[PDB]
Symmetry: C3
């Protein structure tokens, strides 16, 4: 009889990389880089707030277009690229910081407080800012001006008797000319001081024309201050104050903001990118470096294939597969390793289950470590920029670039090491089965050098199956085999 | 005779992770993550300065509580969470930078210089700032005010004729009302310009009430300037100047500052965390991301076990241990690998020393690379923040988070690769000893398939020991063994 | 006959590190860290602009020394440590940002625009700034002063009708005294407002003496503004304006700036460091963390040797090399593995080519992954600093330090894993050749245990060569060998 040891193969393998080979074919591989999105942001499980035409800062200030956002909460605020401001022209020095801290807070919950604005006109309105079809203003701000050509000095307090922090939004009006200023504040100067026991902020307007926006050559500059529990807001101003009407709650949690034009859809997905939600089964992704939720790590590679089967040899360090075993068996489809025989009763093929399972268990162990194991990240740094800004922006970009290159390196090395190891451990299992068989046969068979044993005795199917199931008693046949083996 | 090859085992192993297995038992492991502190900061080898009730900035300015800190030096300044300011209310725009640069300098060494403050009153004092039981002021600052309702314009120089940089601390007084201002500086305005050939700083006070602190609604704002060798300080002011009394040395070295409430103890430890000193034998630690000195790298994992022995099989790619060798020998305690025999003279067990040592040397080589090899770091970035600040703070946190995830990844992969390798190299040594024995026996023995040889000749203890010590002469017994082996 | 299997060796090996060994000798290694520069910056392929005595900012403003730089473009601007300013004394608040954005733009292309400076004197000149031997000023700036003791308020626009962004450079003059100011601007105050639809910048001069530079106690402060397409520059000023004469193109690409004293040479090199160009064949370098172009990654190690041959054994997990094979063959120089024999016709040595090539192909595969594979980087962050700056500078340094430690770790682990693997795969190939030979010999030879087979039949050179070329027919000699092997 002949008893050959072998392993499966498939007509069409997959190419993977290893430590020693750029391109080597295995029976099967899995992709470790997510490269597509469904193109919509799924609305479960993160609570999504669609900004529509409104920036977060315009929803905060209370641009008329944004009244629908009063007191809203979010996990992710989604800012659309079409959003536009439609109220009095303003800027925020350090706009990105205010956006970041509100985004991260996750709430526009606002509480009216009553200030004693004694002796001034309130509720200044502007045609740059229409609510309905009347001249109006930021809902959350209070444009104070002279009463009876008098602007009495303001000096108001507001203790924080609460248990939590308060965020106050206020501003300073910069008139285009000295005429208004006088006209608005009955006053040449204008000075603002907003303070607490822990901070002081002082602003003076800068009179001058700026290019007209909805016909306004004036500007407002927006400022903020956080008042801690047991602290006191003190506003002392002699004009140009754009006053607050109350405070915002300032919370901490996992909330953030993302710039995206993707539609919101009715579906479930843990990981969100500006392109849309992406599955998070894989450890890496090449969709977007901007992510929110439990996401694969962003890498530069568009694909990285993890071998999930042995080297494919159609038709390793242990030398069996692609080694002394000449090729695989495409015809073996119920197992990874097995036996082919020829005896007096014919020719046959059977899978070895123990060795097959050993290989599969190891590979599934690798997959268990790599698949569905992603990290959750929420509010992060900005990673795209529309304007030149210098030093800090250089550092933000360099940080992200550095991180991406280090993760791309990790991904590349991981798959090469794993693949080399996978090819080796499957080669090993072939070798181990070979060696176990050899030892079973003792003096009754000889190794032909190609994975096949020549058995020197009558060996029927029962005999073969006794080999395959490790019950074979060499002693039964020894006399016969020695006689046949050692003749002249 | 029977000669069996085997390996030790222990009743109770340790569980480790590998590349293919989340949980596999080995004979022994070592922990690679330091997870506890002794809860005190050891005072050797770093020179520790306990701030007590004083912040570094208050020790710098000379708050009365802090006079004990004049001219002190440190490796690590320790700021306590109970520290509090007890002098005139002030702020420092960019407080964190001044703290960082003084902390990093490591010295409060101060040198009196004499300015020509011609025509003003000096040594302004305040009841907000008691030294003993008299009204006083920051020791290092000089509150200038009118002399005889006159405030002559100041215009003073101070060349740096030294070889080193000078740090000047100065300030600007912000009166609560226009009344003082007049009252203090006999003057409506107030202007400060501090300059060198390399820098210019210009400040104007902002009059206004701030909430009272030790009854003071005024504030001082603190500024600093560094004067290089061969440069000149020029102070030109018409009031509101809080003047310097001299300069501070500004050094470079390994000094830093840490926020901690841990007690200082009389002991030795290279690595300091806010929780206390930690041993630095291990390569990783999960105690605190804030560290000073030669410290293990901070990781997220609370434990990572490095295998320091073979797979434990009570009662691998090479297929011997947990393979054709059915189990380990708990009874073998003088070696990792050995021989059990049965001959005509009885039954015995001996350790193989060469193979044992081979395994142990490899594992100690791994340990030599990983244990006691930590990196020294001194002044770093801040990693904890008490207040919302926006963009730069977002980047500081994102940088640290990015770094921690990359080190946690390195640690996880390192231990999995090392452990897989350790199990494999110990399996190999078992296999190698088996193969060496087999070759010794030549035609005189047969492999039973389970690690045991059947020897087909009388083999006494001398004979066995000749095998174990590699002196066995197969030729001596060949005739006998062939006769016994190849009979009918 | 005797047929011994063996491997080459060399008298003098190289020491490398592995996972289990700090120091192990192999036949050969390659260095993976570039540690030297040619000491010149090669002028191909990057377009190099040598700043000479001029900083980029002085070439931008138009210091007389720098007129040779008008409208120049660069890939890399090289700033020399001897560069010095020689015009009116100025500063730029956020100097590092303006330098960074111009450096990164890569062009000083300037376009004259005509402003309506109605009613003022233009082309203010200064003896601090000689062009030829006449008093002069920054070429790109326009010092406006009174006409006939009148300073009419300026209010000018300049629409951006172009498709691209415009960068405007302007300034504010700070007179030393109130006398000039009046003298220059016929005016006590002075106010500047530069704005667009998207930004506003407002500056007031600060009167005061600063230390004289080329006899000037006044200073100019430089500002910039970027005007987007379809936007409008609006300058509204009542004095102290240092006006622009036009705009600069602001491009994006791969341009940068580097501080270096290295000479420019006529040669080709992809990677530039301040020390000079360096070859980029290796994956790592220890020359400089400042790089431009396709450069090896900076690591802390001065050397890391990658094994490119087997363990050197003059005169592994598979146990053959440095194992049951006692030593290598220095005399074998045409192959890595081979056969030595003794038969009736003498003693001989031949290389096995198949096994040699197998080893070499694997090692070349590793080298293909590591050599000549560097990453291109252009404008980055600054990595050296001449002055104390605090928080942001702390973060820039911490980011670079973090990155370097992570790459140094990667490099260290990569070479240790690769080397352990290289020693193992070459040990394997020795073992595989041994096993293949053994199987060829079937019952005609016995394994002596030291890599040598005793062949029990007459085996002439033809016979040997039939073994070495895998044609040997064991059946031919079996009768003879069994007779010799199994006698009494
Ligand atoms: C300064 O000049 C600007 C720009 O020429 C003037 O603003 C223009 O004024 C006209 C007439 O009212 C408006 O219809 C234009 O729309 C304005 N242009 C822009 C782009 O703002 C501005 O009024 C002048 N400033 C002063 C105070 O006289
Ligand atoms: C502006 O209002 C503040 C707050 O009401 C005044 O400060 C208080 O003044 C009283 C009377 O002297 C003190 O006893 C309180 O302790 C002060 N409160 C705080 C929190 O500062 C302040 O004096 C007013 N400012 C001016 C210039 O009139
Ligand atoms: C303030 O003092 C400075 C420094 O003493 C004066 O500047 C010096 O003036 C002299 C006389 O003209 C010059 O020759 C020196 O070179 C100046 N020194 C420096 C370092 O600037 C300055 O003029 C005084 N300021 C005013 C407005 O009186
Ligand atoms: C190939 O590998 C993937 C990933 O594990 C697996 O899900 C797929 O079914 C495999 N195909 C086989 C084993 O035929
Ligand atoms: C957004 O703005 C556009 C103007 O372009 C307006 O027509 C549209 O109604 C707005 N969307 C919503 C839902 O308000
Ligand atoms: C704005 O421009 C006009 C000049 O025509 C002038 O009346 C006013 O003073 C200007 N203001 C500033 C900012 O100088
Ligand atoms: C996702 O969005 C980014 C940024 O717009 C884009 O460049 C990238 O190609 C997109 N990826 C996919 C898979 O659509
Ligand atoms: C287990 O491993 C540790 C770490 O090397 C060692 O110090 C300890 O003594 C070991 N125990 C043994 C070998 O019994
Ligand atoms: C620190 O401050 C407390 C006031 O709470 C004081 O009682 C104590 O004496 C101070 N500690 C020292 C050592 O000065
Ligand atoms: C501070 O408040 C009082 C108003 O009662 C006033 O006399 C003084 O002008 C205020 N100063 C400021 C900062 O406007
Ligand atoms: C050390 O301190 C940090 C911060 O207070 C804390 O959260 C952590 O649990 C502490 N670790 C140990 C081992 O005490
Ligand atoms: C040693 O290794 C290097 C790097 O591959 C190679 O270029 C050199 O020629 C080698 N020397 C040999 C193989 O003798
Ligand atoms: C650079 O400056 C020096 C003054 O030290 C001058 O002598 C030299 O001519 C300058 N170099 C060039 C090429 O202009
Ligand atoms: C500069 O110094 C002189 C004092 O002698 C004075 O006339 C002028 O007011 C000073 N200016 C400032 C900045 O106070
Ligand atoms: C290159 O330059 C840096 C910074 O000057 C220096 O410290 C380093 O030693 C230099 N390296 C070489 C190879 O010259």
């Amino acid at each position: 009889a002949t008893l050959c040891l072998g392993h499966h193969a498939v007509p069409n393998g997959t190419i993977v990389k290893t430590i020693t080979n750029d391109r080597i074919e295995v029976t099967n591989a899995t992709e470790l880089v997510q490269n597509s999105s469904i193109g919509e942001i799924c609305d479960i499980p993160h609570q999504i707030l669609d900004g529509g035409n409104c920036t977060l800062i315009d929803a905060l200030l209370g641009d008329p277009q944004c009244d629908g956002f009063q007191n809203k909460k979010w996990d992710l605020f989604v800012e659309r690229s079409r959003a536009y401001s439609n109220c009095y022209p303003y800027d925020v020095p350090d706009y990105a910081s205010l956006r970041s801290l509100v985004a991260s807070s996750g709430t526009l919950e606002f509480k009216n407080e009553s200030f004693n604005w004694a002796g001034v006109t309130q509720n200044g309105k502007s045609s740059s800012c229409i609510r309905g079809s009347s001249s109006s203003f930021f809902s959350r701000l209070n444009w104070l001006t002279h009463l009876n050509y008098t602007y009495p000095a303001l000096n108001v307090t507001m203790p924080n008797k609460e248990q939590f922090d308060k965020l106050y939004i206020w501003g300073v009006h910069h008139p285009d000319t000295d005429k208004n200023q006088i006209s608005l504040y009955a006053q040449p100067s204008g000075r603002i001081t907003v303070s607490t026991k822990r901070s002081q902020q002082a602003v003076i307007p800068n009179i001058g024309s700026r290019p007209r926006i909805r016909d306004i050559p004036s500007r407002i500059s927006i400022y903020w201050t956080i008042v801690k529990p047991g602290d006191i807001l003190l506003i002392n101003s002699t004009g140009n104050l754009i006053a607050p009407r109350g405070y915002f709650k300032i919370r901490s949690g996992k909330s953030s903001i993302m710039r995206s034009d993707a539609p919101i859809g009715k579906c479930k997905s843990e990981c969100i990118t500006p392109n849309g939600s992406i599955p998070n089964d894989k450890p890496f992704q090449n969709v977007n470096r901007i992510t929110y939720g439990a996401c694969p790590r962003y890498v530069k590679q568009s694909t990285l294939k993890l071998a999930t089967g042995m080297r494919n040899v159609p038709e390793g360090i242990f030398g069996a597969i692609a080694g002394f075993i000449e090729n695989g068996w495409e015809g073996m489809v119920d197992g990874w390793y097995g036996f082919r025989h020829q005896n007096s009763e014919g020719r046959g093929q059977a899978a070895d289950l123990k060795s097959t399972q050993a290989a599969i268990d190891q590979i599934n162990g690798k997959l268990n470590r790599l698949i569905g194991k992603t990290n959750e990240k929420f509010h992060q740094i900005e990673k795209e920029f529309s304007e030149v800004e210098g030093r800090v922006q250089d550092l933000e970009k360099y940080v992200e670039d550095t991180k991406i290159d280090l993760w791309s390196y990790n991904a590349e090395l991981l798959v090469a090491l794993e693949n080399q190891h996978t090819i080796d451990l499957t080669d090993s299992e072939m070798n181990k089965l070979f060696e176990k068989t050899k030892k079973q046969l003792r003096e009754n068979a000889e190794d032909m050098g190609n994975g096949c044993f020549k058995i020197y005795h009558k060996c029927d199917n029962a005999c073969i199956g006794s080999i395959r199931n490790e019950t074979y008693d060499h002693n039964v046949y020894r006399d016969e085999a020695l006689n046949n083996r050692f003749q002249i």
